[PDB]
């Protein structure tokens, strides 16, 4: 008889109405609890950085991109063979004249 | 002649003004404001335009808007109308182009490759979800659910490929189910239905 | 006009800078993998540059002769 | 009697499922924020200390050779782009002169 059909949904509701009382309000109750502490430590670091232009927000996806520092390293193999012969590039007096040349010229075009 | 002179620029200014409509939204000044005609496209194939009148007053009020009330114009209006009126008209393009980017996919799915699908496509007046069942024809049924939720882009964000009647022995379900999800994530609809019947 | 005595040094450096770049066997093996060039966001080939150094030795004599600012 | 448990149980789950995820995610919207704040505080609490410890050792020797770890490698590659890709810069300023070419 039809109770076999109705037997499955008498539990389907109790599975969820007993699910709401614990999963909904408790999560609600413990959000103002976190939001309390969440506010606090922000002020503890507002002690070390100022509170406040209108710089916009970045998505969750810009941050989930590969950290470009680790990508520079993985990109080129035998990197430690590079760094040894890389100090002597910045070192020699030739490059110290080019680095300032590019900047010393860029500085005046942005004003005029 | 004071006529022969003004003739050189009027024929050129009346057509380069009609060239803004080729680039995107163009504009026609009016008495109580300006008319802004947001124009859409999905890969070179032009779809329908949308004009959004607007009054040059404070606070800005939209006189009329031919964009659907189905898109969240009001939500983006408030966020961006009074401030960055130029940005209002571009975030709007991100939603209007996304819609006409999806409508031109599903309506081409129905208009062309309909013999493959058993039950009709299930769309939303926003083309927000596409659920649809369909068979690679021996008899190999499938079912899938395109879940669009990024309102800006034209390709989905969540994909399902649960076929009714998948056999565990035939991994060709799995092997094709995996290529059904992945290609729905990176290539448009009408472009893969032509790649699997070539 | 302090560059007119630095630029004439660059064509002496053009030698000295390209030699010490090519004398470092790791500079010349990283370009040609152009995937390495676009992260940095600049070119890295330098042997064809023996005349771009001249293409600027050309126009840097054109800057200060006018000195338009 | 198939009516009651339809309109009452189905609307039950359809009314309480979205209310739940708004709580699962906001509860995790702040837990993931609580994680971050104890990290950013840690990262500043070291970098401020490290720099001025390097300060007190910098003053121990005025000029000195400074070995580089396998960490400072990506940055030298950047600051050297002005040398490596001098072409483009030296060609770009040639056309920056061409902004002033009409003068």
């Amino acid at each position: 008889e039809g109770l076999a059909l109705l037997q499955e949904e008498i539990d389907k509701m109790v599975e969820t109405t007993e699910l709401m009382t614990g999963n909904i309000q408790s999560l609600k109750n413990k959000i103002q609890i976190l939001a309390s502490e969440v506010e606090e430590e922000e002020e503890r670091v507002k002690q070390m950085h100022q509170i406040n232009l209108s710089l916009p927000e970045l998505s969750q996806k810009t941050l989930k991109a590969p950290t470009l520092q680790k990508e520079i390293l993985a990109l080129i193999p035998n990197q430690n063979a590079l760094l040894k012969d890389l100090d002597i590039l910045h070192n020699s007096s030739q490059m110290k004249s080019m680095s300032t040349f590019i900047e010393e010229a860029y500085k005046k075009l942005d004003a005029s | 002649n004071e006529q022969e002179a003004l003739e050189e620029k009027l024929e050129n200014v009346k057509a380069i003004l009609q060239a803004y409509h080729f680039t995107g939204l163009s504009g026609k000044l009016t008495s109580r404001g300006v008319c802004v005609c947001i124009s859409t496209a999905f890969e070179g194939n032009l779809l329908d335009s949308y004009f959004v009148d607007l009054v040059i007053q404070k606070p800005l009020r939209i006189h009329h808007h031919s964009v659907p009330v189905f898109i969240p114009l009001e939500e983006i209006a408030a966020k961006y109308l009074q401030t960055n009126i130029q940005h209002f008209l571009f975030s709007l393009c991100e939603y209007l182009n996304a819609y006409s980017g999806r409508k031109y996919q599903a309506d081409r799915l129905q208009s062309d490759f309909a013999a493959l699908l058993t039950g009709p496509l299930q769309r939303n007046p926003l083309c927000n979800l596409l659920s649809f069942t369909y068979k690679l024809d021996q008899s190999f049924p499938f079912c899938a659910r395109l879940l669009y939720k990024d309102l800006t882009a034209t390709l989905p964000t969540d994909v399902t490929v649960t076929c009714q009647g998948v056999e565990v022995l035939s991994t060709s379900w799995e092997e094709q189910r995996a290529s059904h999800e992945t290609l729905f994530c990176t290539k448009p609809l009408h472009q893969v239905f032509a790649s699997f019947t070539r | 006009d302090e560059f007119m005595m630095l630029l004439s040094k660059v064509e002496k450096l053009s030698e000295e800078i390209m030699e010490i770049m090519q004398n470092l066997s790791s500079i010349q093996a990283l370009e040609g993998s152009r995937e390495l060039e676009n992260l940095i966001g600049i070119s890295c080939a330098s042997h064809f540059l023996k005349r771009e150094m001249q293409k600027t030795k050309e126009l840097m004599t054109k800057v200060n002769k006018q000195k338009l600012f | 009697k198939k009516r009651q448990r339809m309109i009452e149980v189905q609307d039950e789950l359809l009314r309480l499922e979205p209310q739940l995820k708004q709580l699962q995610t906001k509860y995790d919207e702040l837990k993931e924020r609580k994680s971050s704040l104890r990290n950013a505080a840690y990262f500043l609490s070291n970098l401020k200390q490290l720099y001025q410890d390097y300060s007190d050792v910098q003053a121990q020797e005025p000029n000195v050779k400074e070995t580089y770890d396998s960490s400072s490698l990506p940055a030298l590659l950047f600051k050297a782009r002005t040398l490596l890709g001098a072409e483009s810069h030296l060609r770009n300023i040639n056309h920056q002169l061409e902004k002033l070419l009409d003068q």
Binding site: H49, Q50, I51, N52, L53, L55, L58, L63, T67, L68, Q69, I72, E103, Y106 | E2, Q3, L10, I16, L17, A19, F22, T23, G24, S26, G27, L29, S39, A41, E43, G44, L46, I85, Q86, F90, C93, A153 | E37, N38, I42 | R33, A40, Y42, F43, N46, L47, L50, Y51, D53, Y54, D69, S71, S72, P74, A75, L76, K79, T82, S88, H89, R91
Partner: protein, 224 residues
């Protein structure tokens, strides 16, 4: 002719108005028509050159205007964009992909977004260099790809944060601002917490809690 001059004063009152709100103005737009006799399709090619902010550029393209009262549709057959050689390969793929997708509304869609980000790059590196001009050095001007954070006192140790805006495979704009570390090993000899390594992973979550403006002035205040 009185009003024939006021027609220019009013239809040019439309030209600048568009150049302001769009950010896109238009200069040369020649028009070319082609009839084909053989339900009747007609083709036009026309070339256009405009400019956005500092970005100057030219568009040459063709449209396959199909004509039929039952199908008044339209399409394009081939675009070809050429721009100036810039240092960002995005502008070499900006052409490389737009030709395989061929709509120009997305072209002008992201370019508004692109130059709008690029101007954040300029205004912030100009806002930091007016507030902290003794610790920030712009490697390649106010339009530089990044920023140095050092002094003439400790040159062997700086932090360069890299402002890198890009455009995805979809055709939409995706910036990415992460961190690099320039340091001598002598400073690692003393670092006991070793937060210098987990610096990009920390920095990609440093702009999260604070935003660009607040994270970076924090990282500059922690340095000095």
């Amino acid at each position: 002719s009185k009003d024939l001059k006021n027609q220019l004063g009013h239809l040019e009152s439309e030209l600048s108005f568009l150049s302001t709100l769009t950010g896109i103005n238009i200069r040369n737009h020649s028009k070319q028509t082609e009839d084909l006799t053989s339900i009747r399709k007609v083709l036009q090619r026309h070339r256009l050159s405009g400019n956005c902010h500092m970005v100057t550029f030219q568009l040459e393209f063709q449209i396959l205007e199909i004509q039929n009262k039952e199908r008044l549709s339209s399409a394009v057959t081939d675009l070809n964009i050429i721009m100036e050689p810039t240092e960002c390969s995005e502008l070499s793929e900006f052409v490389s992909r737009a030709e395989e997708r061929k709509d120009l509304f997305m072209f002008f869609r992201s370019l508004h977004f692109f130059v709008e980000w690029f101007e954040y790059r300029k205004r912030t590196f100009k806002h930091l260099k007016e507030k902290y001009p003794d610790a920030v050095y712009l490697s390649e001007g106010p339009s530089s790809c990044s920023m140095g954070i050092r002094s003439a006192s400790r040159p062997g140790f700086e932090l360069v944060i890299v402002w890198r805006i890009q455009i995805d495979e979809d055709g939409k704009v995706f910036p990415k601002l992460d961190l690099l570390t320039k340091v001598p090993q002598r400073a690692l000899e003393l670092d006991k917490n070793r937060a210098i390594e987990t610096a990009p992973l920390s920095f990609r979550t440093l702009v999260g809690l604070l935003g660009i403006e607040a994270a970076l002035e924090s990282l500059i205040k922690s340095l000095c």
